[PDB]
Amino acid sequence: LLPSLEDLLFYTIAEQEKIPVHKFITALKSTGLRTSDPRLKECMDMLRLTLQTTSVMLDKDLFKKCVQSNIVLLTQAFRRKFVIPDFMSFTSHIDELYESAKKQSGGKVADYIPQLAKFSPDLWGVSVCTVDGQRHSTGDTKVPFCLQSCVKPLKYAIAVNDLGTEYVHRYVGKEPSGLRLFLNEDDKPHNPMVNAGAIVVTSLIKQGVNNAEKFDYVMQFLNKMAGNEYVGFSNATFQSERESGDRNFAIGYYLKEKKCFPEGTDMVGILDFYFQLCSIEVTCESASVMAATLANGGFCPITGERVLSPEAVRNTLSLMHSCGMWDFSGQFAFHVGLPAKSGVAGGILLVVPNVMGMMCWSPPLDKMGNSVKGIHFCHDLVSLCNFHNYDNLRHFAKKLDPRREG
Amino acid sequence: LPSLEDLLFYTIAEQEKIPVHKFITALKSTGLRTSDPRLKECMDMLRLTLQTTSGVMLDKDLFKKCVQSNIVLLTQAFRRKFVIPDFMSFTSHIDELYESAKKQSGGKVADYIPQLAKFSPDLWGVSVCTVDGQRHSTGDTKVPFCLQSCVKPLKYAIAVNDLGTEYVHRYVGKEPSGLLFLNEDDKPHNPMVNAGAIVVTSLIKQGVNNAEKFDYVMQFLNKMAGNEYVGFSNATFQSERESGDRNFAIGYYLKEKKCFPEGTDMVGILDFYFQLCSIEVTCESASVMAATLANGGFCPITGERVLSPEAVRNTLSLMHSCGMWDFSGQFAFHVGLPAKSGVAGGILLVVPNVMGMMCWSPPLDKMGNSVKGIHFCHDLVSLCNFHNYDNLRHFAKKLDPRREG
Amino acid sequence: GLLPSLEDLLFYTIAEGQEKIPVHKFITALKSTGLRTSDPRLKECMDMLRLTLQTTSDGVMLDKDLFKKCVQSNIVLLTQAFRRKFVIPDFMSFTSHIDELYESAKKQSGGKVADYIPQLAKFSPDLWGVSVCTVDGQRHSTGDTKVPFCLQSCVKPLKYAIAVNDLGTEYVHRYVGKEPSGLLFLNEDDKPHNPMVNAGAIVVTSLIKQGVNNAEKFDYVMQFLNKMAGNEYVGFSNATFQSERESGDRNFAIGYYLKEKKCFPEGTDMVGILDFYFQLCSIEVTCESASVMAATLANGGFCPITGERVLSPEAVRNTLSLMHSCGMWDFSGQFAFHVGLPAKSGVAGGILLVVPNVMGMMCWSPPLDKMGNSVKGIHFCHDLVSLCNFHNYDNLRHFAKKLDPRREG
Amino acid sequence: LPSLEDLLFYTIAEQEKIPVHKFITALKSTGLRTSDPRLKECMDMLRLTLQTTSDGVMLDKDLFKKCVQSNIVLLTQAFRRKFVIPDFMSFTSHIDELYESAKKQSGGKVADYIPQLAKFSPDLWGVSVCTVDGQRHSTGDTKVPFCLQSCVKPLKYAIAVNDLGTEYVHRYVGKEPSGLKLFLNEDDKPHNPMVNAGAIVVTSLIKQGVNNAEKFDYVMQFLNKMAGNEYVGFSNATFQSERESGDRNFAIGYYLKEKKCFPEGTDMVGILDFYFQLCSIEVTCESASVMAATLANGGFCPITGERVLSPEAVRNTLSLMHSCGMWDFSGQFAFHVGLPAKSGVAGGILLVVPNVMGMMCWSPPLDKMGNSVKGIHFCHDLVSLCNFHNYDNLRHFAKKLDPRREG
Ligand SMILES: NC(=O)CC[C@H](N)C(=O)O
Ligand SMILES: NC(=O)CC[C@H](N)C(=O)O
Ligand SMILES: NC(=O)CC[C@H](N)C(=O)O
Ligand SMILES: NC(=O)CC[C@H](N)C(=O)O
């Protein structure tokens, strides 16, 4: 009845009675998946074992032997079922967008922390990870840098995940500021995407256990969001933050005075936990998986595991849309229309919902604290593709739609 | 090789002839209306065919004679290619949401003018027009009422269409205020508040007189509504102009702050502004206007291009963040849909790529938003993965009407 | 025992040991006290001197009989003048300081004549006048002190004083606040912040003489300013009034906003009140007549050159308090701290200035600084308090090196 | 030309010898206290004369001269009704009536944010007067120690301006009411020295360079001069509680440091400590009234004659007390009362009637704006009765009475 889906896929990769391993790997990579994709491990484990047998071809039987455990995911890849079918074409566009933004040399590397915010201004990296796990990187995408305020969406998602929308917003608002004292009309910080809200959010997570276990908890959570790619910690940055955090201590003592914390909070300990979270290191590549988890409804696209509740992800994307780019948030929301969160190390965590996640990193910031190259890339991207939140999917004038074939 | 009309014919038959009522009943179940302008040739031919009797049955060749001219649309309709395939199931959910909000009898009918205070608190209508022209109304959806601030996205869309983003926003901002009148640049905060709308009004069709400015807008609103009802309440306009002290304060303040293009007659612009607020619609015709905004600027029941994609994207963005007065931030967070409320009780609602809607009930909550409409919008999104930041693949237990199963 | 008459006592002081006093010698001695022979309180004495001067061809010598005859009806005021009982006893010396202060402020030629209406733009920037009227009626002017100009916002304390005079403190402040704003139309009770800014002045205007028409209201205020000015010059610039009404978009915005917020007494015709407000801004004074108005405020509401009670002590105290904190636009806080005098500036370049218990002054020069205050006048105010212990919180017993013109040596 | 001693002697012995009690009784009726530091030589010689009895309790012209000669100028001013309030006993009667009227105002809440303030009885109420000539009057609980709290804010600003001048001090602090927490005005300075942010900055200007123990002693020595060496103490219990519960003040201090509002070389956390100490300095109504009298008298302490503050310091302090001294009530207090005043959370109101007298009113129960209810009531009543409003007129003042005039 059914010519096995393995056999079907074998005769679309051949046409020619055996398939060399290199030709299978090359074709796989042209789909956008990496050979290292964790959902492909059994297939790659079977390829490693078959290759050990001789100093290397593949009949229909050996092909079924290697692909049968992952045949569904491989088929969607090879039959152009992914969110961006023509990924190689899309990748060329990202590279042009990267090169155009590389010429933008304005901005100043933040210097308030000595601790390696002596980063080179020429550092510039862009990483893409689609909701189906297709990957592309250009530039300095393996270099660790601190999330800084890029961590704010992530830890708010964690808190809404563990505690729910209602409890979290007992303590922090859900709206942009006004031209920004610290607290809105209900004497809550305005939203989780500014320092006061992030500090209150930090006090909500894993209450009860000590700070060392809270950090372990958040790290394990970030690991799931990144599909177990690079997450780390900059103790140097942490020490800088805690010695130069005069504004944050002011916020902390103010929040404590206005009774903004859940009962039982040690505010100075929370501030320390806050500085730790800002000092978490990612790379562009690992951070883009984190964004793609947000783009994919809370499922990590390269592992398939449910990481956040959909309520946590919708809420996070909403507040990233309106509050994520500091004083530029209103203009960014209007011209780019994408959930994004910037950080003072030069990172912009960018989310194209249902499509892809991205991390852009260039240390030189503009006057509002946003990476100059990153802001430029974001504008170009949406000017090229119909990814703006309120672009139309049918009628989009000169823009390109990478979700489509023609 | 075999004809599209025949394939469609063989789908509706099973049975060498299709009864006419069978064809019509199947067509309406898709959600298209018999009166759809894109179906006029089909329906005229059906009407003419029945006159020249010879019975009431359509064989293959007669079927081809009738549907030939609109075959593409009739097939997208019949092959379940529309944005909401199981439209009748969705329709029944709309009615449920309608009946829930009907019971929310709270709020106060606006009474700063006699025309608004006249309206019964119990008038409540909801109308739906998808981006493919599928229609559904429940309640008081053929009762005329004034757009009031619901016109503000529409005239801004007209301004961006004729003038572009960069020009228009020399005069008006693009953010919620959070709080007045002017932002840090001495511009009104956004086009969705009186000060910004008054300035947007002064950008439209500069040079010509007010009668021609108005007719230019009315003809524009007619295209957005697929030529359904757009009218004018002179009674409301006269009351607006004699009780709008606040609006006169804004207008003089704008003139003092030099907020208008050079050559503006501010009191004339205020008059034009009051006229735009007094334009009348029904839920049904306003829902087509919203659907045009849902459909990238093409009117879904006529196929006509009305607005630039740029105008539509801008308007949706500012409706999202600024369209529900002091509730805008909470609406964006919990509903996540572009919407615009007005003091007559209307909420102009857009679900991008899906549909436009108009909800109307005169009683307002103390933020100025129709109580029944606010309740309906929350219910709608609690039920369907329509929130701007819902996910289209993983959406918990929400219903997705774009799908079949 | 009995009485050697006060008239004869005074005659001997003026008659330096001689038999008769020539009339010119009496006038010169009188003028040296600071009083003007035209002082309304001295009219009988001057009438009698004029009658005596009629009997003779040229000049007359006054014996004690003729002296008592001319002087008897005003002998008390004349005795205080001549026995140095006036608030500034050595007025000639003080007058020389005012002239020095005047001359050095004359050199401050910066600022910009207001030009939002043509009438204000036409005034030359070198017009500069300063006039002093003490609470005892001693007068001094230097510069362009008889040139009419519009009170503009300088009228704001005056109509507020009229409203408190007629209506009381509690009623008036149902409608307007009593504090400086800081940073925009209404305070937290939805009242204009104070009567010294446009919104509060417009509301104050709607409180005065309600129920009669605008023409009768203006006559009423005009008569009131005449009393405050001791019947010196008060007028009206219809040209300024017309330009104000056609140019004041900000004031129309304010009036529509106040109407919206229900800031007016019930029954107010708001555009009619705006018209009345433009009229009040267009009232004309000179430095000399305006200094008498200031001196009425310095003197607890008694006009010092007529002795008539013009305003209640309550109206005057309220007015001086709000001029102190709110009278110099955005510069009020600095002016209160460094000058410490109730003052009120206007866009024509006037600064109505009060030294309570001492004197009133009008300084006028059209060129304004970026805050709307006359450059020369502001310079003069600072100099005056650098020189004399007139600051609100200068101490009257220990004031270090400042002069105190109230004291003899 | 007869001698001032003899002239005064005749004025008192209407008749060849004055009894001592008669001299003392007439002296106290001028309002001067027999303990006045300016009268010590007179008082010392009087008691020494009583020891060597002889004549009895009777003073002749030569004994009177021996006793009063060293203080004759002051005693003559007193006895010849030349003090600023000549009929002091009558004025005293009015103060008493005003006191009793405010005593019936039992509203308000004692501050409870630290236990030291919470333990004070609501019914404590005292009012003390010291004129610029040293005339003294007290009614109620005027010998009960309480903390200055924010009443110290004008006193340390006055010290700062005295030592450093107006221009330097106001590089760091503004000179106007705020009207609109905010913390900072447009120039990124605290609005004025009468609010916590400005006071904290002013605290950081005094005796820069020396340690906090020496800064504190410098200030205490300064307050003791203002108070004519009457009680100035310290509540370490209040200080401990202040620093343990001053979250808001730590917020301000870190914000101030973030915005670079301190002089360079400032240890903000140590300045916060010094600030809590200044708030914990103790006075009584009687000694605090002398402090306010010093401000009333252009910087001279009226019961010692000592120059304590420059006139510049005093004028600045009185100006900012006028417009900024009663928290959110400042604008209304300036309009209706028109007197320089400073309230504090322990119930004190430091009150200055310039050229006339200083006062301290104290009652712990505060109103919703932080001001003592009985004290606010007394200040209104005082100015309703007397032409002491800054913009009252000294010649035409309606039905008010002027205690400076005789009739
Ligand atoms: N803006 C950022 O990226 C955060 C920087 C730093 N951790 C702060 O809290 O201010
Ligand atoms: N909210 C509204 O619908 C406003 C309408 C009304 N005409 C106004 O301009 O205020
Ligand atoms: N400062 C002024 O004198 C302004 C007066 C002017 N007529 C106005 O109402 O604005
Ligand atoms: N406000 C006061 O008078 C004292 C309390 C104030 N919180 C302080 O700094 O001590």
With CA atoms as reference, report the closest residue to B200 among B303, B105, B111, B272.
Answer: B272
Q: Which residue, by CA, sits nearest to atom 9 of ligand 2? A: B194
Tokens representing A268 are: 């100075």
With CA atoms as reference, report the closest residue to D325 among D312, D313, D310, D338.
Answer: D338
Smallest Cβ–Cβ distance between A313 and the set B295, B298, B391 belongs to: B391
With CA atoms as reference, report the closest residue to D128 among D88, D92, D181.
Answer: D92
Spatial distance between the Cα atoms of D359 and D350, rounded to a whole number of angstroms? 6
User: CA-CA distances (angstroms) from residue C63 to A165, A267, C23, C59, C75?
Assistant: 104, 95, 10, 13, 16
Pick the atom of ligand 4 nearest to D248's CA. 7
- Positions of chain breaks in chain A, given as the residue before each break (C to N > 2.5 Å): 15, 55, 180
The answer to the question of residue B402 being in a domain is: no
Determine the distance in angstroms separating the CA of D181 from the nearest CA of chain A, rounded to an integer: 7
Chains B and D touch (3+ CB pairs under 8 A): no
- For residue D346, give the ligand nearest its CA: 4
Spatial distance between the Cα atoms of D329 and D320, rounded to a whole number of angstroms? 14
Residue D15's identity, in one-letter code, is Q
- Give the DSSP letter of residue A262: P
- For residue A147, give the ligand nearest its CA: 1
Spatial distance between the Cα atoms of B141 and B151, rounded to a whole number of angstroms? 18
**What is the helix (H) or strand (E) element at residue B139, kind and residue range?**
strand B135-139
The answer to the question of residue B157 being in a domain is: yes
- For strand C283-285 and strand C21-22, is the pairing parallel, antiparallel, or unpaired? unpaired
CB B174 to CB A397 under 8 A? no
Are A257 and D248 in contact, with CB atoms under 8 Å apart? Answer: yes
Spatial distance between the Cα atoms of C255 and C271, rounded to a whole number of angstroms? 7
Are D135 and D85 in contact, with CB atoms under 8 Å apart? Answer: yes
Are A73 and A40 in contact, with CB atoms under 8 Å apart? Answer: yes
The helix-helix angle for A267-278 and A235-243 (nearest 10°) equals 130
Question: Strand runs (DSSP E) across D159-313, as ranges?
Answer: 232-234, 281-283
Q: Which residue, by CA, sits nearest to atom 5 of ligand 2? A: B148
Spatial distance between the Cα atoms of B370 and B377, rounded to a whole number of angstroms? 11
User: CA-CA distances (angstroms) from residue B224 to B289, B298, B347, C142, C395?
Assistant: 5, 8, 17, 74, 77
- Positions of chain breaks in chain B, given as the residue before each break (C to N > 2.5 Å): 14, 54, 179
Tokens representing B320 are: 């999202």
Smallest Cβ–Cβ distance between C259 and the set B245, B251, B255 belongs to: B245
- Indicate if A117 and A232 belong to the same structural domain: yes
Chain D residues with CB-CB distance to A181 below 8 A: 181-183
Are D354 and C395 in contact, with CB atoms under 8 Å apart? Answer: yes
Spatial distance between the Cα atoms of C132 and B20, rounded to a whole number of angstroms? 103
Count CA atoms closer than 13 A to D351's CA, side-chain side.
35
Determine the distance in angstroms separating the CA of C98 from the nearest CA of chain D, rounded to an integer: 23
Tokens representing C370 are: 């970026």
Chains C and A touch (3+ CB pairs under 8 A): no
Backbone angles phi, psi at B317, to 5 degrees: -60, -50
Which residue in the block uniquely carries the two structure tokens 């060849």? D16
Determine the distance in angstroms separating the CA of D166 from the nearest CA of chain C, rounded to an integer: 10
- Indicate if A193 and A65 belong to the same structural domain: no
- Indicate if A202 and A168 belong to the same structural domain: yes
- Give the DSSP letter of residue D284: -
Spatial distance between the Cα atoms of A78 and A80, rounded to a whole number of angstroms? 6
**Cβ atoms within 10 A of the Cβ of D123, count?**
12
- Give the DSSP letter of residue A326: G
Which residue in the block uniquely carries the two structure tokens 């400015």? B213
Are D118 and D346 in contact, with CB atoms under 8 Å apart? Answer: no
- Neighbouring residues of A368: CB distance < 8 A, sequence distance ≥ 6: A325, A326, A327, A328
Burial D150-182 (b: 16+ CB within 10 A, else e): bbbbbbbbbbbbbbbebeebbebbbbbbbbebe
Domain count of chain B? 2
Helices (H), D183-235: 196-203, 212-226
Question: Strand runs (DSSP E) across B315-398, as ranges?
Answer: 339-341, 346-351, 355-360, 363-364
Determine the distance in angstroms separating the CA of B163 from the nearest CA of chain A, rounded to an integer: 17
Pick the atom of ligand 2 nearest to B197's CA. 9
- Indicate if A256 and A182 belong to the same structural domain: yes
- Indicate if A34 and A108 belong to the same structural domain: no
Spatial distance between the Cα atoms of C100 and C384, rounded to a whole number of angstroms? 10
The answer to the question of residue A62 being in a domain is: yes
Spatial distance between the Cα atoms of A292 and A129, rounded to a whole number of angstroms? 6
N- to C-terminal Cα distance for chain D? 31
With CA atoms as reference, report the closest residue to C236 among C226, C227, C228, C246.
Answer: C226
Q: What angle do CA B71, B74, B76 make, to 5 degrees?
A: 105
Spatial distance between the Cα atoms of C115 and C368, rounded to a whole number of angstroms? 11
- Indicate if D294 and D341 belong to the same structural domain: yes
| Residue C156, ligand 3, Cβ within 6 A | no
With CA atoms as reference, report the closest residue to A34 among A25, A43, A24.
Answer: A25
Q: Which residues pair with A299 in a beta bridge?
A: A306
* Cβ burial, residue A89 (10 Å; 0-12/13-18/19+): exposed
With CA atoms as reference, report the closest residue to D91 among D301, D404, D326.
Answer: D404
Return the percent helix, strand and coil in chain C, to nearest 5: 50, 10, 40
The answer to the question of residue C314 being in a domain is: yes
The answer to the question of residue B108 being in a domain is: yes
- Indicate if D46 and D95 belong to the same structural domain: no
* Cβ burial, residue B95 (10 Å; 0-12/13-18/19+): middle
* Cβ burial, residue D61 (10 Å; 0-12/13-18/19+): middle
- Indicate if A168 and A199 belong to the same structural domain: yes
Spatial distance between the Cα atoms of A382 and B307, rounded to a whole number of angstroms? 20
Backbone angles phi, psi at C350, to 5 degrees: -85, 145
**What is the residue-wise DSSP string for C268-291?**
--HHHHHHHHHHHHTEEE-HHHHH
- For strand B18-19 and strand C367-368, is the pairing parallel, antiparallel, or unpaired? unpaired
- Indicate if D73 and D138 belong to the same structural domain: no
Tokens representing B128 are: 């739906």
Alpha-carbon torsion (A102, A105, A108, A109), positive or negative: positive
Round the CA-based radius of gyration of chain B to a whole number and report it: 23
- Indicate if D323 and D270 belong to the same structural domain: yes
Which residue in the block uniquely carries the two structure tokens 């009120």? C344
Query: What's the CATH code of the domain at B338?
Result: 3.40.710.10
The answer to the question of residue C134 being in a domain is: yes
User: CA-CA distances (angstroms) from residue D235 to B35, B332, C353, D391?
Assistant: 89, 54, 47, 38
Spatial distance between the Cα atoms of D285 and D287, rounded to a whole number of angstroms? 6
- A344 C-alpha vs ligand 1 centroid, how far in Å? 6
Backbone angles phi, psi at D137, to 5 degrees: -150, 140
Burial C169-198 (b: 16+ CB within 10 A, else e): beebbebbbbbbbeeebbbeeebbbbbbbb
Subunits adjacent to chain A (3 or more Cβ pairs under 8 Å): B, D
Smallest Cβ–Cβ distance between A331 and the set B174, B318, B336 belongs to: B174
| Residue A149, ligand 1, Cβ within 6 A | yes
- For residue C154, give the ligand nearest its CA: 3
Experimentally determined by: X-ray
Backbone angles phi, psi at C145, to 5 degrees: -100, 0
- A62 C-alpha vs ligand 4 centroid, how far in Å? 82
Are B389 and B336 in contact, with CB atoms under 8 Å apart? Answer: yes
The answer to the question of residue C405 being in a domain is: no
- Indicate if B43 and B94 belong to the same structural domain: no
- Indicate if C333 and C187 belong to the same structural domain: yes
Spatial distance between the Cα atoms of B398 and B382, rounded to a whole number of angstroms? 7
Chain B residues with CB-CB distance to A294 below 8 A: none
Spatial distance between the Cα atoms of C107 and C379, rounded to a whole number of angstroms? 10
- D150 C-alpha vs ligand 4 centroid, how far in Å? 6
Are B313 and B192 in contact, with CB atoms under 8 Å apart? Answer: no
Determine the distance in angstroms separating the CA of D88 from the nearest CA of chain C, rounded to an integer: 20
With CA atoms as reference, report the closest residue to B87 among B130, B126, B138, B25.
Answer: B130
Are A149 and A365 in contact, with CB atoms under 8 Å apart? Answer: no
Burial D14-26 (b: 16+ CB within 10 A, else e): eeebbebebbeee
**What is the helix (H) or strand (E) element at residue A333, kind and residue range?**
helix A329-335
| Residue C240, ligand 3, Cβ within 6 A | no
Spatial distance between the Cα atoms of A399 and A166, rounded to a whole number of angstroms? 39
Are D125 and D369 in contact, with CB atoms under 8 Å apart? Answer: no
Chain B residues with CB-CB distance to A393 below 8 A: 353
Question: Strand runs (DSSP E) across D92-244, as ranges?
Answer: 109-110, 126-131, 136-140, 146-147, 232-234
**How remote is the C-alpha of C56 from its chain's centroid?**
40
Chain D: residue whose CA lies nearest to A251: D251
Smallest Cβ–Cβ distance between B389 and the set A317, A391, A397 belongs to: A317
Spatial distance between the Cα atoms of C248 and C390, rounded to a whole number of angstroms? 37
- C277 C-alpha vs ligand 3 centroid, how far in Å? 10
- For residue A194, give the ligand nearest its CA: 1
Chain D residues with CB-CB distance to C135 below 8 A: 395
Query: What's the CATH code of the domain at D34?
Result: 1.10.238.210
User: CA-CA distances (angstroms) from residue C232 to C146, C216, C227, C292?
Assistant: 11, 21, 9, 8
Which residue in the block uniquely carries the two structure tokens 């060597």? D52
Tokens representing B89 are: 């199931």
Smallest Cβ–Cβ distance between C395 and the set D180, D314, D396 belongs to: D314
The answer to the question of residue D201 being in a domain is: yes
Tokens representing C394 are: 């200068």
* Cβ burial, residue B260 (10 Å; 0-12/13-18/19+): buried
N- to C-terminal Cα distance for chain C? 35
Tokens representing B396 are: 């918990």
The helix-helix angle for C155-167 and C270-281 (nearest 10°) equals 120
Spatial distance between the Cα atoms of A235 and A240, rounded to a whole number of angstroms? 9
Backbone angles phi, psi at D264, to 5 degrees: -65, 145
Are D317 and D158 in contact, with CB atoms under 8 Å apart? Answer: yes
Round the CA-based radius of gyration of chain A to a whole number and report it: 23
Burial A229-264 (b: 16+ CB within 10 A, else e): bbbebbeebbebbbeebbebbbbbbbbbbbebbeee
- For strand A145-146 and strand A280-282, is the pairing parallel, antiparallel, or unpaired? antiparallel
Q: What angle do CA D258, D262, D267 make, to 5 degrees?
A: 85
Which residue in the block uniquely carries the two structure tokens 């555009």? C271
- C344 C-alpha vs ligand 3 centroid, how far in Å? 12
Range(s) of the domain holding residue C313:
92-387
User: CA-CA distances (angstroms) from residue B205 to B24, B154, B200, B217?
Assistant: 44, 15, 11, 9
User: CA-CA distances (angstroms) from residue C225 to A83, A363, C199, C290, D302?
Assistant: 83, 69, 22, 9, 45
